[PDB]
Structure formats: C-alpha cells, structure tokens
Design a protein around this nucleic acid. Structure first.
Ligand code: N5P
Ligand code: MG
Ligand code: MG
Ligand code: MG
Ligand code: MG
Ligand code: NA
Length: 533
DNA sequence: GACCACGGCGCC
DNA sequence: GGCGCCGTGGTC
C-alpha cells in the first residue's frame, strides 16, 4: 500500500478509518482510506467517500457499517481480520494485540489502518486455512453475524425517559431516608458510598465481627455476602443492604440511561462486541444492555422503561435451560437426555426443595453453580444448610448423571494434551494452566476449561439462530433489537407480533437438532418486563 | 480532564 | 463459569 492513489479504491479493497470516539453511533468519521494491490487511497471527504464503498472490509468492519447505517447507507460489514484471529485464539480481542501478533502496528491514521487490515488478513486467512471447522464458523456464523449485529446496533431500543426521570426522584427520596437512618445508627455521618469508611464503622466502631477479606489488598470485606451473614447482628446492616441496592440501580441505570438517548433516533444504542469473550459469547457495552435489572422489585421497575415503538410490541424469546441441554448432548448421559426428552424440569425441581419465578431463579445459582465446580462449603452457605453430609447434596448428582463426570474428565485430559478445549462446532479456547503445578491455579483452569464447551456451544447455537432468523424478520417487517446470551428481544408491528413470535420460536428451536430438543419460551408485551410474562 | 486498581455488583 | 459499569481513592 506504499503508493498513494486517488480515491476511490477498486472493489475488494480493505478499509481503514478513524473515529472521534469508540462508539460508532456517536462518532464523527475523521478519516477514511482503502488499500489494495500496493496502493492506498485516502478519501478527501470521508462522509461523502462512504457512499463509494460496496462493503466495509477490514479491521473493526462492523463499526464502520454501523456508522454508515446511521447515515442512512446500506453498507454491510465483510471480512474482518479480528474475527479470523478471534476464532484462531479468542484471547485475540484487540486490534492492538492482533497487529503485534500477526504482523503490523495499530496506528491512528486511516491509510496505515487500511494497509494493516490488508496485511493481517493475508496472514490470518492462510492460518485459518486447513482449519476447516474454524473456517465454517467464520463463513457460516461470525462473518454473517457481524452484519446482523450492525443492524441491531444502528436500530437501538426505545426507552421511557419521562418514566425513569420520575422514578429517579422517588428513589432519591428513599435513599435519603436510608442514609439518614444509617447515620443515626452510626452515631455520625460518613460517606456511605466509601467501602473503606463503611469498613471502619462496621468493624472498628460498631465492633461487628469481620467475616472475610478482600482479594488484592486484604481489607475486611463489606460485600453483600458478608452483610447478609451479619443481617441480625445490628439494625444498621439491613439498612446498608437496602442502600446498596437502591444506589447501585440509580447510579448504573436510572440516571445514566436517559442521557444516552440518541438525538436522531430517540433510542438507546448498545455495542455488541464480537471478539470480547474467552468462550464465544457476545458482550454488550456503552451502554451494557445485557445486564438490565430483573430480580428485585426496583429492578423490575427499571426493566419496564424498555418499551416498543408506538404501535409495535416487544417479543422476548429465551432458550430453556440451554446449558443443561447442551451438557446432555455433549456428555451423552442417558438419564439427563431422558429428563429432557420426557419433559421434566430441573430448575423448578431444585426450587421447591429449597415455586414462582423468584424462587426458581435462586435454583439457577444452585444447579448451575454446583455443576461448574462449586465447593460444598460454597453450596453449604449458599443454600443456608448444614455442610453435611459431604458435600452429599452435590454428591450422587454424578451418580444419577454418571456420564457427566466422565465427560468432564475426558474434556480435561484432552485439554491437557492439545492445550485447548472446543465447542460442538469446534470453537477453541486455549487453557495453558491445566498443567500448572500449583493446585489452586490448576483447578481454577480446569473449571474454565470444562465450562467453555458448554457455555460456548450455547453461544454458538444462539449466534447461528440469529443468523438464520434475521432475514426472516426483515421479510416480515420486524426488528431484532437485543441478545442477552440465551435470550433475544425483537420488535414487531402489533398485528404481526404473534406471527413473528411463532416463526422466531421455530427458528430458534430448530437451529441445530441435538440429542435433546431445544425449547424456547416466548412472551409478547409493550415493555421488556411484561414481554417476559 | 483522563486514566488507574479495587471492591463491589448488575445480568446470563 | 462468562461479562461490563459504578464510586472511591488515587496519579498525572
Ligand atoms: O455459576 N453460576 O453461578 C452461574 C453459571 C451460569 C449461569 C448462571 C445463571 C445463568 N447462567 C448461564 C446458563 C445459561 O446459559 C444462561 C442463563 O440462562 P437463563 O437465565 O435464561 O436460565 P436457563 O438455564 O436458560 O433456564 P430458563 O431460561 O428457563 O430460566 O447463563 C449462574
Ligand atoms: Mg433460559
Ligand atoms: Mg435467559
Ligand atoms: Mg475487576
Ligand atoms: Mg475523583
Ligand atoms: Na492468512
């Protein structure tokens, strides 16, 4: 790309671009270039130059596509060396790291970024050649998904701003009641948001027993777990837990979200990061819309602020127990497979032992938590029960589901020999510490390693389903808005919502037939909370 | 102003 | 197990 040639570039060229800020819905496009065949082409006027491209091909392609969609241009993302690198090794998460590893330097200049995209793609493509399964994942899942995500990002989701504003004032008044009570009990005001100040008050001034210490600096912890244990030692504790809940939700959702509404769309626009996790899941940021509250009453009130466009409805679809079903398929356990083929339910079953949607959620931490290496001592204090018999409550699980333990053992042994583990579709995660000589490190690694094929296969299935579903939705005049790992949120014209729900449900359930059926629960509503029933 | 480590905590 | 964001106490 050494030789400068006039804009525009020939087709197939790789693009480089510089944004005033990371978020493509908010960014000014500062510069735009393209590189091909020993030539680099710099655009004199980036916005207008955008009209010359047939597709965004290069590093961070989806970001340029989103910005183009923002500007009303149907420019899809194409090849992206980040996706190749991320499939080769999902620790490849940044252009900085990928450049250093595969043969260049990530700079702040568009031409250089275009030249770099071209060279990295050449080096990665060949590496990803011969890896037929990763190649299939690239062509059939990741590359097409990037176009789907680009449209989700540019579309956004409507937020009831007036509602959240009123909710803010109400929550502020309750926070004031809580602070005032805490200060009376402490005998003096202090910064209740400072865990250092709180630690002194609880443990030095009120003489409460310390329970645990913090990881890096060894302070006496004031975490929810510690406070819960101290709930009956002093009236101040309950008030602090309530304060923690309200301030967490006010500072993270109630106050920030209304300020993130885009002036042009009137909606909230998240970023779905495609090379961000060790397992093949997506992440969401700026804002994060994959962690909107749902558990507590105030949380639920916040979830109600997410609403459909006037005259449309939200459709929410959630895979049922997807990780357990995946485990059944991967392990081949007959008992577990039978549980699903018959129609039994695992989450609800542990719930009654320990049933509405509230007490069923708590079961999720249990069944799942125990499944992924949770120590009995953990389950003990997490279930509020005697540490006995063993274990015990965790035991026998492997007895009734024997093939699961065997799958775990085989997964680890293979991970030790090859240095990585894989999903059903061959997505890999390298786990070098499986051979660490320090037990705590090695066992932490083991839990990461055997988790990945389960979490990652579930992620693979959801991505493939999004790729299958997206074009059907366009045809029906419906929109895909959000993904939350095992859930999708769509928006449909009211008259069509029912037909969309039915279709979307079939597509997600039939995505890839397993030894067990995939089941999908679906709700329709004017807001996110009511759409999940 | 920007950025950092940490503890803490929201969701799957 | 997997994420990203917040306020505090802090540096530059
Ligand atoms: O270790 N943990 O504590 C732990 C580990 C994994 C966990 C959770 C809580 C959820 N997951 C995983 C497992 C699932 O893939 C997804 C959660 O999905 P979900 O909340 O919709 O619960 P499902 O298991 O899918 O069942 P459900 O949708 O019918 O309630 O994320 C907790
Ligand atoms: Mg589910
Ligand atoms: Mg779910
Ligand atoms: Mg951290
Ligand atoms: Mg400060
Ligand atoms: Na290559």
């Amino acid at each position: 790309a050494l030789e400068e040639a006039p804009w525009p570039p020939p087709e197939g060229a790789f693009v480089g671009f510089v944004l005033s800020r990371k978020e493509p819905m908010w960014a000014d496009l500062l510069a735009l270039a393209a590189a091909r065949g020993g030539r680099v082409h710099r655009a004199p006027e980036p916005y207008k130059a955008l009209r010359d491209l047939k597709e965004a091909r290069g590093l961070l392609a989806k970001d340029l596509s989103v910005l183009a969609l923002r500007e009303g241009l149907g420019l899809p993302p194409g090849d992206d060396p980040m996706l190749l690198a991320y499939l080769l090794d999902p620790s490849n998460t940044t252009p900085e790291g990928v450049a250093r590893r595969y043969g260049g330097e990530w700079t702040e200049e568009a031409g250089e970024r275009a030249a770099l995209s071209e060279r990295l793609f050449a080096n990665l493509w060949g590496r990803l050649e011969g890896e037929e399964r990763l190649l299939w994942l690239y062509r059939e899942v990741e590359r097409p998904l990037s176009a789907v995500l680009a449209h989700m990002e540019a579309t956004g989701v409507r937020l009831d701003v007036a509602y959240l504003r009123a909710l803010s004032l109400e929550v502020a008044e309750e926070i004031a009641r809580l602070e005032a009570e805490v200060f009376r009990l402490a005998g003096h005001p202090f910064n209740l948001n400072s865990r250092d100040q709180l630690e002194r008050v609880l443990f030095d001034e009120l003489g409460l027993p310390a329970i645990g210490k913090t990881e890096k600096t060894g302070k006496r912890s004031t975490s929810a777990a510690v406070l819960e244990a101290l709930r009956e030692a002093h009236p101040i504790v309950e008030k602090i837990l309530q304060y923690r809940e309200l301030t967490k939700l006010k500072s993270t959702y109630i106050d920030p979200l209304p300020d993130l509404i885009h002036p042009r769309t009137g909606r909230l626009h998240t970023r779905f990061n495609q090379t961000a996790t060790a397992t093949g899941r997506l992440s969401s940021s700026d804002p994060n819309l994959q962690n909107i509250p749902v558990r507590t009453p105030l949380g639920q009130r916040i979830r109600r602020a997410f609403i459909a466009e006037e005259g449309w409805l939200l459709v929410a679809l959630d895979y049922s127990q997807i990780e357990l079903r995946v485990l059944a398929h991967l392990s081949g356990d007959e008992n577990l497979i039978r549980v699903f083929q018959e129609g039994r339910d695992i989450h609800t079953e542990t719930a009654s032992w320990m049933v509405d949607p509230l007490m069923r959620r708590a079961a999720k931490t249990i069944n799942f938590g125990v499944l992924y290496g949770m120590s009995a001592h953990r389950l003990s204090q997490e279930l509020a029960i005697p540490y006995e018999e063993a274990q015990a409550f965790i035991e026998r699980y492997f007895q009734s589901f024997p093939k699961v333990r065997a799958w775990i053992e085989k997964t680890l042994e293979e991970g030790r020999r090859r240095g990585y583990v894989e999903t059903l579709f061959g997505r890999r995660r390298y786990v070098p510490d499986l051979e660490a000589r320090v037990k705590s490190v090695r066992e932490a690694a083991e839990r990461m390693a055997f988790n990945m094929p389960v979490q990652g296969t579930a992620a693979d299935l959801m991505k493939l389903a999004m790729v299958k579903l997206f074009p059907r939705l366009e045809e029906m005049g419906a929109r895909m808005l959000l993904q939350v790992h095992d859930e999708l949120v769509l928006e449909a014209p009211k008259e069509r919502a029912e037909a969309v729900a039915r279709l979307a449900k079939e597509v997600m359930e039939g995505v890839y037939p397993l030894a067990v059926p995939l089941e999908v629960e679906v709700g329709i509503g004017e807001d996110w909370l009511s759409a999940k029933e």
